[PDB]
DNA sequence: GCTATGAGTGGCCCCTGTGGAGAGAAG
DNA sequence: GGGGCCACTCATAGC
RNA sequence: CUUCUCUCCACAGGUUUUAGAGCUAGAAAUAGCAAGUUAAAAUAAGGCUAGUCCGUUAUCAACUUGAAAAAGUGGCACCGAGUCGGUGCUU
């Protein structure tokens, strides 16, 4: 007989639980086959289990590594670049100064050259460094001096600044000489009193330097400012001054009266285009405001960035930066000055203890700035005469180095001016630095567009760049190469939706005109309207539509139903009294693009004739798809003879945002066979039917429908892994639908291929992805109708009826006892929604009986699921060289014993080899029976060829039949039932579950929430009462954990002092005592052994860091479900 | 008795921070 | 949070 | 309206080895003194499809077919419950 039977689930991150129960809630028990060579034939299991399995990663740290790769790639392209330009001459002076360069990081013993790189002798080198202690020196000399420098000291500062060439946040032109904040500031006032001599303002006594320059925000220093000058409000035109100058984003349209929006903010590509607009609009005269403006904007930026500007160079930033190094300098002598007169004692552990956070810990250690201000503060305000040094370390200025983190808010203009004078002052001796100036500056100023990606010919699934040629992509000939607009197009395109109704369409720009268009006329479709004689309300004809969309949606930009019925019912048909339904007050759908498009163009023949719906279409996706005007101004000059230069420059200065819904060929592409109209056309007039959108696609007479239906085709793949990859939502939550799918498929599988009545699931959009996914899966079979027989009902339920069923009927649930939750979670949902189903589409003892006992069954099928590891070769900290071999070469020619490296290899799956290994300075062959880890580096070389791998370690005769793919969290048996799972080569896991009786568990969570139980005081009243007498539990329950740690957890030391742990707080309140007690089933867990806290003990958790004993137990591979399985004897392999 | 070796035990180790642009769904 | 590594101590086989 | 997910573009550090002649007294251990701020190269081993590209996401019990994708392989009922046991039928 076809047993009736019915499926619960429960879908977590971490698990999956899955319970089989019949019609009267019983879980069936089956005898199933065992596989292997082992004596245990037949086992007999519940239909009940969990499925527990890593949680899964998001791909963002796959994308920030494969970005730095990038970013290495093309930085050391760059300096490849400079070799190359330098390389013809650097040949005449030194023609081993690259290869010396290069070859720096090696040991003089591996070194083909001097070990010197830049001079090759080391008189040379030490006049270099005496001469030049820091590269600013360098840099600040050519700078400054005329005269002819050797070749090496350019090479040198060119490659440092290409190498870091700081950040690109502001765009334009930044001009380091107007770099003092007090000038600009008056200038910029007495700029604006002589624009508005009738109300001057007094910035006398008022210090703008401290104010626009302090640590506060633009706001508050914007606030600071204004309220220093008697007269002003930030929202005044000068207020907007500063506002701009302080890096916001002011409004000038309320300053000047305009009609538009004029928001300027410098950082802004555009500030130049918009500033030309708002002069167009309020007269030039004002321009000489704004560019004093901008001098004082650029002056407070760079007041932080560079600070002396007292001195004629053309280097703030090197400049800057000795006097850091001298500043530095003195308060090191004074420093140790005052340390040797006052602490003679304390020397030792600030300047010659690189352990502690003293200077040697902060020079030659690894302490940060912080670590050695807060070692060095206590210190010196125990001596005198360190006023300074306090105020010093107060700043953050006290001894501070040259390359500290605060380096990242310097602009590249900074050093492209240091470039371009270091440059222009030596190209008078050298010919090919006054030719390739422009390539230079190219090579430090070029980046590759945001929009454009990667430069790859198609072997890269990242990459969008469309190719005008085959060249070779240069910073100098990217512009030739590249076509930028296709590429931003693609850009654009790649990630908007495809049609919902269609999946091969694109959908529509969200201001188009056409979707406008079908927006009002879908409108005005479900409109009513009634006047007086009328017995019933009337839809609007196609020509009334028509009207009313040219008379009122053409002319207003928003329209309302007072409009309407006094412009075209009255005016128009003559109606004094109409009262129209379907539309409340106002239409949401507006024709502001067209409106826009009549206030540009200025002609409403071009905007209303059918023949440049084309031209505006592709007009209004240029605006949406690109940034870049020049991109749009490219695009759109092919409509150069349609508008005049007015129109065009101002067509140039829309941008539209957001995307449709639906296609073009959806509503004005396909035609009907029958009529040839359109869904637009439809919606324009449709005689007495006006049929909306939803009726025209669900009417089965209009072709539309079935040739939708015939436009879908079964997605090749896609069901299966692609389909669920193609959900929304983490890819954690992925990874449990594919793992509860193939647990019901399993399910399925073991019942002798019957579907089940029911699938019960709780975790909703998600959900509804399930439920959708299982009911394709379970129904495949149509009637003779085309209608598809629900023979499986997926029905979903949500956890808060489950948990009141638990709380009422006092089925109580704590997680840390065991993973046996999850599965009695998947059958409480199982029965829950069974029995509400069938009731709207239980006896008490009986089924209260059943659910009793199914909870208190022993056996549940724990499954951990076998990973193959993958991820990093290692961890990525690089350690110091030492005399050990478990270091990892970063390079194939570098020794780890004198280069370092690095550390800890992560193994993907270990084999168990059987074969001979020489032992002994004898070198005498002895038979070998062990697991060895085989890395995830090593992955690819052992797959391809284990014999050779494993001889190359060592091993001699392998037995090739006997290596066996063991994975992670694989399982052994071992005696008395005892479980390890394997957590790498050389370490294991506990592999047993602790199954206490339910009365156990129930005055645990009793006891747990004694003072938080949720419920009217007489049931409170009554389980504290119940709890309260039970109190002899608690021995019960150590004795159970003893009993269970002696047989397989093997913790003498941890066990014994748990033992005794409880016996000194056996007097605690019993509150207390099982809170602490849930702690102690840390001991008893599955997975990896962890610490835990009992009361004021700290238990420290016990490492399993042996695997020679499982090399004689019994292998179980389980499958997903843990019902098919495979028993493999060990012990019984590699015998002599 | 000495030497080199494996096995158990306790403790320490882990790359980080920021900006800009675009697209999507889900509540 | 969890596996890798090292320093220290103790049987342990072999000489 | 935000959060989360995916993709591209850049920056600043960090670590590693090497260069920046250490001096004096002593046979040496060692003790005293002087100096400290920077720079080059690497930043997953490398791969071929030779690109200013790609290399940490996702997927993966065992056996048979295959290069892989992928397909196939395991009796039922009843009585009980400490990780499942026993009995009958089929066999």
Same mark, same amino acid.
């Given at each position: 007989m076809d047993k009736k039977y019915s499926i619960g689930l429960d879908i977590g991150t971490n698990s999956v639980g899955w319970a089989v129960i019949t019609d009267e809630y019983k879980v069936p028990s089956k005898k199933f086959k065992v596989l292997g060579n082992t004596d245990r034939h037949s086992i007999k299991k519940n239909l009940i289990g969990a499925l527990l399995f890593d949680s899964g990663e998001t791909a963002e740290a796959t994308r920030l590594k494969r970005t730095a790769r990038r970013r290495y790639t093309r930085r050391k392209n760059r300096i490849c670049y400079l070799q190359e330009i330098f390389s013809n001459e650097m040949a005449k002076v030194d023609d081993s100064f690259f290869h010396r360069l290069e070859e720096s990081f090696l040991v003089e013993e591996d070194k083909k050259h001097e070990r010197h790189p830049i001079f090759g002798n080391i008189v040379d080198e030490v006049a270099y460094h005496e001469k030049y202690p820091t590269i600013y020196h360098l840099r600040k000399k050519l700078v400054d001096s005329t005269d002819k420098a050797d070749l090496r000291l350019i090479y040198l500062a060119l490659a440092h600044m290409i190498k870091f060439r700081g950040?690109?946040?502001?765009?334009?032109?930044?001009?380091?000489?107007?770099?003092?904040?007090?000038?600009?500031?008056?200038?910029?006032?007495?700029?604006?009193? *002589?624009?508005?001599?009738?109300?001057?303002?007094?910035?006398?006594?008022?210090? $703008?330097?401290?104010?626009?320059?302090?640590?506060?925000?633009?706001?508050?220093?914007?606030?600071?400012?204004?309220?220093?000058?008697?007269?002003?409000?930030?929202?005044?035109?000068?207020?907007?001054?500063?506002?701009?100058?302080?890096?916001?984003?002011?409004?000038?349209?309320?300053?000047?009266?305009?009609?538009?929006?004029?928001?300027?903010?410098?950082? !802004?590509?555009?500030? %130049?285009?918009?500033?030309?607009?708002?002069? $167009? *609009?309020?007269?030039?005269?004002?321009?000489?405001?704004?560019?004093?403006?901008?001098?004082?904007?650029?002056?407070?930026?760079?007041? %932080?960035?560079?600070?002396?500007?007292?001195?004629?160079?053309?280097?703030?930033l090197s400049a800057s930066m000795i006097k850091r190094y001298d500043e530095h300098h003195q308060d090191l002598t004074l420093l140790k000055a005052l340390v040797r007169q006052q602490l003679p004692? &304390?020397?030792?552990?600030?300047?010659?203890?690189?352990?502690?956070?003293?200077?040697? +810990?902060? #020079?030659?250690?690894?302490?940060?700035?912080?670590?050695?201000?807060?070692?060095?503060?206590?210190?010196?305000?125990?001596? %005198?005469?360190?006023?300074?040094?306090?105020?010093?370390?107060?700043?953050?200025?006290?001894?501070?180095?040259?390359?500290?983190?605060?380096?990242?808010?310097?602009?590249?203009?900074?050093?492209?001016?240091?470039?371009?004078? #270091?440059?222009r002052r030596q190209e008078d001796f050298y010919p090919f630095l006054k030719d390739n100036r422009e390539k230079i500056e190219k090579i430090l100023t070029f980046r590759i567009p945001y929009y454009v990606g990667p430069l790859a010919r198609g072997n890269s699934r990242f990459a969008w760049m469309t190719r005008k040629s085959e060249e070779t992509i240069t910073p100098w000939n990217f512009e030739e190469v590249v076509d930028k607009g296709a590429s931003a197009q693609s850009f654009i395109e790649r990630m908007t939706n495809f049609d919902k109704n269609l999946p091969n369409e694109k959908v529509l720009p969200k201001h188009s005109l056409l979707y406008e268009y079908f927006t009002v006329y879908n409108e005005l479709t479900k409109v009513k309207y009634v006047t007086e004689g009328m017995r019933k309300p009337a839809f609007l004809s196609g020509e009334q539509k028509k009207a009313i969309v040219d008379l009122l949606f053409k002319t207003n930009r928003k329209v309302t139903v007072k409009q309407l019925k006094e412009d075209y019912f009255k005016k128009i048909e003559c109606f004094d009294s109409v009262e129209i339904s379907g539309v409340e007050d106002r239409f949401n759908a507006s024709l502001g693009t067209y409106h826009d498009l009549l206030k540009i163009i200025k002609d409403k023949d071009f905007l209303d004739n059918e023949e440049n719906e084309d031209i505006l279409e592709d007009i209004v996706l240029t605006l949406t798809l690109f940034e870049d005007r020049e991109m749009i101004e490219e695009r759109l000059k092919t409509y150069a003879h349609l508008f005049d230069d007015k129109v065009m420059k101002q067509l140039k200065r829309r941008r539209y945002t957001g995307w449709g819904r639906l296609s073009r060929k959806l509503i004005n592409g396909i035609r009907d066979k029958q009529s040839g109209k359109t869904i637009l056309d439809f919606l324009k007039s449709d005689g007495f039917a006006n049929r909306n959108f939803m009726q025209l696609i669900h009417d089965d007479s209009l072709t539309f429908k079935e040739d939708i239906q015939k436009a879908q085709v079964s997605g090749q793949g896609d069901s299966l892994h692609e389909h669920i990859a193609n959900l929304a939502g983490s890819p954690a939550i992925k990874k449990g639908i594919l793992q509860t799918v193939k647990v019901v498929d399993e399910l399925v599988k073991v019942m002798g291929r019957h579907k089940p009545e029911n699938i019960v699931i709780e975790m909703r959009q998600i959900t509804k992805h399930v439920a959708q996914i299982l009911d394709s899966?379970?129904?495949?079979?149509?009637?003779?109708?085309?209608?598809?027989?629900?023979?499986?009902?997926?029905?979903?339920?949500?956890?808060?009826?489950?948990?009141?069923?638990?709380?009422?009927?006092?089925?109580?649930?704590?997680?840390?006892?065991?993973?046996?939750?999850?599965?009695?979670?998947?059958?409480?949902?199982?029965?829950?929604?069974?029995?509400?189903?069938? !009731?709207?589409?239980?006896?008490?003892?009986?089924?209260?009986?059943?659910?009793?006992?199914?909870?208190?069954?022993?056996?549940?099928?724990?499954?951990?699921?076998?990973?193959?590891?993958? +991820?990093?070769?290692?961890?990525?900290?690089?350690?110091?060289?030492?005399?050990?071999?478990?270091?990892?070469?970063?390079?194939?020619?570098?020794?780890?014993?004198?280069?370092?490296?690095?550390?800890?290899?992560?193994? $993907?799956?270990?084999?168990?080899?059987? $074969?001979?290994?020489? /032992?002994?300075?004898?070198? =005498?062959?002895?038979?070998?029976?062990?697991?060895?880890?085989?890395?995830?580096?090593?992955?690819?070389?052992?797959? !391809?060829?284990?014999?050779?791998?494993?001889?190359?370690?060592?091993?001699?005769?392998?037995? &090739?039949?006997? #290596?066996? !793919?063991?994975?992670?969290?694989?399982?052994?048996?071992?005696?008395?039932?005892? /479980?390890?799972?394997?957590?790498?080569? +050389?370490?294991?896991?506990?592999?047993?579950?602790?199954?206490?009786?339910?009365?156990?568990?129930?005055?645990?969570?009793?006891?747990?929430?004694?003072? =938080?139980?949720?419920?009217?005081?007489?049931?409170?009243?009554?389980?504290?009462?119940?709890?309260?007498?039970?109190?002899?539990?608690?021995?019960?329950?150590?004795?159970?954990?003893?009993?269970?740690?002696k047989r397989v957890i093997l913790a003498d030391a941890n066990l014994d002092k748990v033992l005794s742990a409880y016996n000194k707080h056996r007097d605690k309140p019993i509150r207390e005592q099982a809170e602490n007690i849930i702690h102690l089933f840390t001991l008893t867990n599955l997975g990896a052994p962890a610490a835990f806290k009992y009361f004021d003990t700290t238990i420290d958790r016990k490492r399993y860091t042996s695997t020679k004993e499982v090399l004689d137990a019994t292998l179980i591979h389980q499958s997903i479900t843990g019902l098919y399985e495979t028993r493999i004897d060990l012990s019984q392999l590699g015998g002599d």
């Open positions: 950040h690109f946040l502001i765009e334009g032109d930044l001009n380091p000489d107007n770099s003092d904040v007090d000038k600009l500031f008056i200038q910029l006032v007495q700029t604006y009193n *002589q624009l508005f001599e009738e109300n001057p303002i007094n910035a006398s006594g008022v210090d $703008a330097k401290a104010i626009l320059s302090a640590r506060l925000s633009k706001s508050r220093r914007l606030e600071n400012l204004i309220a220093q000058l008697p007269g002003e409000k930030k929202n005044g035109l000068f207020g907007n001054l500063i506002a701009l100058s302080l890096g916001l984003t002011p409004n000038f349209k309320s300053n000047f009266d305009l009609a538009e929006d004029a928001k300027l903010q410098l950082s !802004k590509d555009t500030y %130049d285009d918009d500033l030309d607009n708002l002069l $167009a *609009q309020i007269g030039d005269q004002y321009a000489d405001l704004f560019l004093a403006a901008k001098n004082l904007s650029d002056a407070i930026l760079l007041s %932080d960035i560079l600070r002396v500007n007292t001195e004629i160079t053309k280097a703030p004692e &304390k020397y030792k552990e600030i300047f010659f203890d690189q352990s502690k956070n003293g200077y040697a +810990g902060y #020079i030659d250690g690894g302490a940060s700035q912080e670590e050695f201000y807060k070692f060095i503060k206590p210190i010196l305000e125990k001596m %005198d005469g360190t006023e300074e040094l306090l105020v010093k370390l107060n700043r953050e200025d006290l001894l501070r180095k040259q390359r500290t983190f605060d380096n990242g808010s310097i602009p590249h203009q900074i050093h492209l001016g240091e470039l371009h004078a #270091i440059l899966r379970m129904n495949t079979k149509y009637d003779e109708n085309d209608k598809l027989i629900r023979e499986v009902k997926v029905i979903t339920l949500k956890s808060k009826l489950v948990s009141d069923f638990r709380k009422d009927f006092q089925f109580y649930k704590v997680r840390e006892i065991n993973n046996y939750h999850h599965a009695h979670d998947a059958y409480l949902n199982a029965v829950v929604g069974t029995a509400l189903i069938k !009731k709207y589409p239980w006896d008490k003892g009986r089924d209260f009986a059943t659910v009793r006992k199914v909870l208190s069954m022993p056996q549940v099928n724990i499954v951990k699921k076998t990973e193959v590891q993958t +991820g990093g070769f290692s961890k990525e900290s690089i350690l110091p060289k030492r005399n050990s071999d478990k270091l990892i070469a970063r390079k194939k020619d570098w020794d780890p014993k004198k280069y370092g490296g690095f550390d800890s290899p992560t193994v $993907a799956y270990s084999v168990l080899v059987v $074969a001979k290994v020489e /032992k002994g300075k004898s070198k =005498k062959l002895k038979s070998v029976k062990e697991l060895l880890g085989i890395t995830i580096m090593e992955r690819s070389s052992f797959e !391809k060829n284990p014999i050779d791998f494993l001889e190359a370690k060592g091993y001699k005769e392998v037995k &090739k039949d006997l #290596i066996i !793919k063991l994975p992670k969290y694989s399982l052994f048996e071992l005696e008395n039932g005892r /479980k390890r799972m394997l957590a790498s080569a +050389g370490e294991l896991q506990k592999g047993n579950e602790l199954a206490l009786p339910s009365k156990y568990v129930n005055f645990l969570y009793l006891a747990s929430h004694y003072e =938080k139980l949720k419920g009217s005081p007489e049931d409170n009243e009554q389980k504290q009462l119940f709890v309260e007498q039970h109190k002899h539990y608690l021995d019960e329950i150590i004795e159970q954990i003893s009993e269970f740690s």
